[PDB]
Amino acid sequence: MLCEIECRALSTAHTRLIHDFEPRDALTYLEGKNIFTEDHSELISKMSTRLERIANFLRIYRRQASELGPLIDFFNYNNQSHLADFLEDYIDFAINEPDLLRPVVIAPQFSRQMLDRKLLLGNVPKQMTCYIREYHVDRVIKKLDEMCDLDSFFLFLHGRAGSGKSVIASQALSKSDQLIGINYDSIVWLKDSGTAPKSTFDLFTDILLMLKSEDDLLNFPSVEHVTSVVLKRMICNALIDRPNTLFVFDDVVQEETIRWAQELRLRCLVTTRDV
Amino acid sequence: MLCEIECRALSTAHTRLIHDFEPRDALTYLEGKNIFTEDHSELISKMSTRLERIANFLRIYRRQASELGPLIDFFNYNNQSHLADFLEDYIDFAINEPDLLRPVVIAPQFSRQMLDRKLLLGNVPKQMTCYIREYHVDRVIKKLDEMCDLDSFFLFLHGRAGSGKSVIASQALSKSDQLIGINYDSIVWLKDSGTAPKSTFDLFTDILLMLKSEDDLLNFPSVEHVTSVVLKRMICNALIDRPNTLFVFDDVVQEETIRWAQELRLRCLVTTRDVEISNAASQTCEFIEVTSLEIDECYDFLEAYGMPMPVGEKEEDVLNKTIELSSGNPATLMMFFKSCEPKTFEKMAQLNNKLESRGLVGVECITPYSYKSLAMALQRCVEVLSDEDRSALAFAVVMPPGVDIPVKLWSCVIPVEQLDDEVADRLKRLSKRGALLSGKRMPVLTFKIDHIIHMFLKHVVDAQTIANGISILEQRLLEIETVIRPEDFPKFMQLHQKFYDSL
Amino acid sequence: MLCEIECRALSTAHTRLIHDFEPRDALTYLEGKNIFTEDHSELISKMSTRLERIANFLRIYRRQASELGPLIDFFNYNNQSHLADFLEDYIDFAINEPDLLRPVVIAPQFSRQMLDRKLLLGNVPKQMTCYIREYHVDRVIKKLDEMCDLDSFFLFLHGRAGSGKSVIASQALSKSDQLIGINYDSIVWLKDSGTAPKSTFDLFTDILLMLKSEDDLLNFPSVEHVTSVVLKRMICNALIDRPNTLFVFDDVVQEETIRWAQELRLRCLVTTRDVEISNAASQTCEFIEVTSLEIDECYDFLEAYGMPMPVGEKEEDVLNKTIELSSGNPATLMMFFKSCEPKTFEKMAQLNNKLESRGLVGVECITPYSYKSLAMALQRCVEVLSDEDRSALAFAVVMPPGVDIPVKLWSCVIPVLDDEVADRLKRLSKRGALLSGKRMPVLTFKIDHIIHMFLKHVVDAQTIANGISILEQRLLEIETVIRPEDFPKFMQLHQKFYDSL
Ligand SMILES: Nc1ncnc2c1ncn2[C@@H]1O[C@H](COP(=O)(O)OP(=O)(O)OP(=O)(O)O)[C@@H](O)[C@H]1O
Ligand SMILES: Nc1ncnc2c1ncn2[C@@H]1O[C@H](COP(=O)(O)OP(=O)(O)OP(=O)(O)O)[C@@H](O)[C@H]1O
Ligand SMILES: Nc1ncnc2c1ncn2[C@@H]1O[C@H](COP(=O)(O)OP(=O)(O)OP(=O)(O)O)[C@@H](O)[C@H]1O
Ligand SMILES: [Mg+2]
Ligand SMILES: [Mg+2]
Ligand SMILES: [Mg+2]
């Protein structure tokens, strides 16, 4: 197999590999340098359009070669050297230097991305604006940054009632552009307020659905009736597709919540009154 | 069908079969060498993602082939020989040269981030960090390593209640990188705590689902209604796709569990309080007892959680009072800390009092324990007790705790010819079953009740039955230090007048 | 059509027919030698990949040719002679010699195959290891080997309760590698224990599912509601895919089971306590009785489980007391060990007492047995008993155990020429082996101790004393030696073993 660098190259130089190229031209040269099979060449060789032969050549290729050699050593011979030169240039601006791009910005306006889009979908409330508690929103954000490294952790933003804890979580996830995108990929903000004994399970029913794709909210089953061991397994399942995901649990009253959060190895911001 | 070796290989070499491979490529070569069917290839050939075609190819394959030949003889032809070479290497470090498989072909792919994936999915709890019981977590891991070879086996991590067994399994499967990946492929950790007769079946309903693929949890049927013979057959079925899989059964109370585990030929770690559930298994049973925390370990545990270490002599004593009271007990010790508020040696001694005049309820607190106080736990240990044994225990209140005392001196308070060995038989069952007592063969057959196991009974038995047992003692009490009490001096239990007047 | 030899060749030489070959090359040569059709060549000739043209050439070919000639006579002409030579070599190492491979081993480690895999899926229990009854597990296996030839047959591994029958079936199918793989292809081991009339049908519901593929356990219908004629037809249907399949029916109580087993033409191992269920079958019935553990085997069994062997004379005696008491019995013996706590010859003798003054309940313990004590088992063996026979048994309390005693001496306590007594006492040993028949010197039976302290703490405390009096009445009116008819007037020899009531 290749990797992200070698596959990012076949993708970046894609506007070009469409204007002038042909997989039939390379099939003979690759059945040869030992990177194909007589079904492989059959599959890519009998394709009505070229974008088909190209998409199959780039799919099949990324699996077969130990490296990106026998494709630079081909655009050369095929009078398509303006191609093998671009790709060799790209492999060099990474092979000879240990520095690139980090998680940052090169397609700007995270203003609808990190803001709008991710906040809204994670059910984060519309941050307060006319006064901001400097000290606190800052210290929250700081201690969250320190932890994006951690595998699972609790942050307790605890206080008096109406003391203002929940508003600060709104602001701490709404000021920076780092917490969402840079430090954590997604946000899930759920209000608890559970008092009944069925509440600590019902909560995690609506997490599981905060997770599930826009598709298959239709298929949402009578999950209403299914054991705790299963909702839990069913969640940490659907939780693979969610790299670094933050959980705000606005208003926890029951420590059973907290026990579930720790069985589910979650990353949690927690507003509560009882510490 | 394949087996655990041939299926453990398809699983070990899985990080790889995902990066470069395709079941469509192999379908033609296998409809051919006679190992598939025209529905088989249909089922794996029309699948949107490849991880689907791969998981179906590896599921369908493990059932169909008499061996793992026609898949090495394919990665070769498909220019994916870096694959068929790895698998042929693995099949060779098993038949000819044994042992060498784990050091050589299994370890060079360990990854401290893959464990966590496997731990989480096997529902393993978040191992403890601020103090680790060296000795035990080590010895657990050791005896598990010795057995990955074995086909099915029971490991009994048995102890007192709140004695800390379950935490150690969290750590023993969380320290090394060997137990998961090297010695066993996957983990399934399920909490039992079953009391009903439907519980031993319900357990194995949630195993079966601990096994089943992320796919077809949707299709999960009303399996809720289906015989025991079928859930059992249905499991050992879906158990093929699981080469070397470990089972932690946190908190077994019923020996029916243990009988199912042995019909299902499972590999089991077992935390329990009652040790005799092992008599259900006619098999490789090996044991590790979680003892009361030694006096030195208690210090370590205290320091670890910011607890101030002594200086003055009547301060190391304030702390020997806590260690004596919570007769070396993880769970109640923890409840103590959470409740030691100011941290002072002073407020630490305040509590030492609260413990004598309120039993365990003086320090009951919100703790990582499912239980507010050790009394909520022991409740159960006492319900399960033989009706006759429930009686024996109930009277052992009126003893001296932390004192080694003769059988006859016990024959006096305990209910029931001329030989009262029957007392001893009950007292053994009594230490075997929640470790409520304490047996000690020579110099002379004597038992002993600790303090945690005492202030339990103090604030729990009928206020009357305490005083009735005391009188029932002062009767037999007459009729004709590192030293046990002699038979010339039983007439006077008065040595412990101190620890008797406080009733 | 070809056959297994000629098709095994096209398969063995397959790694090769993929590296260099082409069905287009042979189509013309075969449309010719009369072995194809102009659709055949169309079907194999228009195929994108070659593994397609090859798999269709080898599928289509195996059906069409009377033999494997016109394919050796082709790799020759096609410069692929290194192929037609390999296949002609293979056809010769079978045509010129009458010997090959048998059902055996050439892909080794049946240790997960025959063992693990087939045993587990047939729901066979985890064989015992720390002691093996040599004689028996061996004789079981032997008589099973003799029969893999047979089309359907019953093997009755019958004995006392807790006498150890089921464990031996675990071992007899777990020692060898022959019984599973060599003699029989698969195993189905099902526990019966059926008492209701719906039980003999419910059993066969779970056979049918022991048979059904891993696929379509999902499709399992409400088979719960469907006639007996259909479950039966539905089974012997799904039973085609199962060449030489063995059935262990652990614990049959009802002879209706046995009638179904014989309508379904099954091959059955059968553990049971009541032996007469075999009269239900008009057939090859062969039997193996699990006797009480001989005195020497008891020693072996004790040592095997860390039990201390005698020295002093009144210590081998302490141990002959246990062996006498648990009148040689696997299950109650095991309960003893689990309960022998300190291991001392002393605490061993403590228990020897507890047994006389509390019956089997003195040593009841958690054991690999489904039962706390042998009394929980025997319960059933007694319920099943003919209403009249339940009576006969109930009185045999008032006998001397471990004593060979005459029929007339029994005619005294038993309800009703009194041969009728003997008839009941036979039914009684046949049906749970509660008694013990012994033809000459004179027709005498005998009750063991385990089969006694059962009745001791179980029959009406009154009926014991009433039978004793009912005896002292008839007792008058006119060692390796049986009691003579000149001396029946005095059952007083056993005053010792009588005063203890
Ligand atoms: N800029 C602000 N910062 C903090 N609190 C504010 C601000 N503006 C208004 N508030 C008051 O706080 C209310 C919401 O309080 P908030 O939810 O922050 O407290 P809380 O800690 O969540 O209380 P709870 O104990 O109910 O969780 C607002 O609607 C208003 O009454
Ligand atoms: N190594 C440890 N570090 C910190 N706390 C511990 C440790 N061992 C035990 N405890 C205390 O005991 C509680 C859980 O005890 P644990 O579950 O380990 O005992 P247990 O033997 O499983 O009891 P049970 O058999 O009832 O499950 C924890 O909340 C903690 O308070
Ligand atoms: N190695 C052994 N061989 C024979 N019996 C044993 C052995 N070890 C233990 N036993 C005793 O036999 C018990 C199981 O008895 P078993 O099931 O063999 O008798 P059985 O003939 O099946 O009785 P049933 O009449 O109930 O069918 C064991 O759990 C134990 O009590
Ligand atoms: Mg709020
Ligand atoms: Mg626990
Ligand atoms: Mg049985």
mmCIF file of N, CA, C and O in Angstrom, chain C residues 120 278 393 418 494:
data_model
loop_
_atom_site.group_PDB
_atom_site.id
_atom_site.type_symbol
_atom_site.label_atom_id
_atom_site.label_comp_id
_atom_site.label_asym_id
_atom_site.label_seq_id
_atom_site.Cartn_x
_atom_site.Cartn_y
_atom_site.Cartn_z
ATOM 1 N N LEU C 120 -17.107 -29.503 20.077
ATOM 2 C CA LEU C 120 -17.824 -28.318 20.566
ATOM 3 C C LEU C 120 -19.147 -28.076 19.846
ATOM 4 O O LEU C 120 -20.142 -27.704 20.463
ATOM 5 N N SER C 278 -35.169 -50.043 26.268
ATOM 6 C CA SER C 278 -34.630 -50.670 25.069
ATOM 7 C C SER C 278 -35.600 -51.667 24.450
ATOM 8 O O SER C 278 -35.495 -52.018 23.281
ATOM 9 N N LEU C 393 -40.139 -51.129 46.828
ATOM 10 C CA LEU C 393 -38.881 -50.444 47.100
ATOM 11 C C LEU C 393 -38.931 -49.835 48.475
ATOM 12 O O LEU C 393 -37.965 -49.911 49.246
ATOM 13 N N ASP C 418 -45.214 -67.002 46.233
ATOM 14 C CA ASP C 418 -44.782 -65.619 46.142
ATOM 15 C C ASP C 418 -43.488 -65.521 45.333
ATOM 16 O O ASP C 418 -42.383 -65.391 45.877
ATOM 17 N N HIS C 494 -27.960 -60.141 62.130
ATOM 18 C CA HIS C 494 -27.838 -58.724 61.799
ATOM 19 C C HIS C 494 -28.468 -57.828 62.855
ATOM 20 O O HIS C 494 -28.892 -56.710 62.553
#
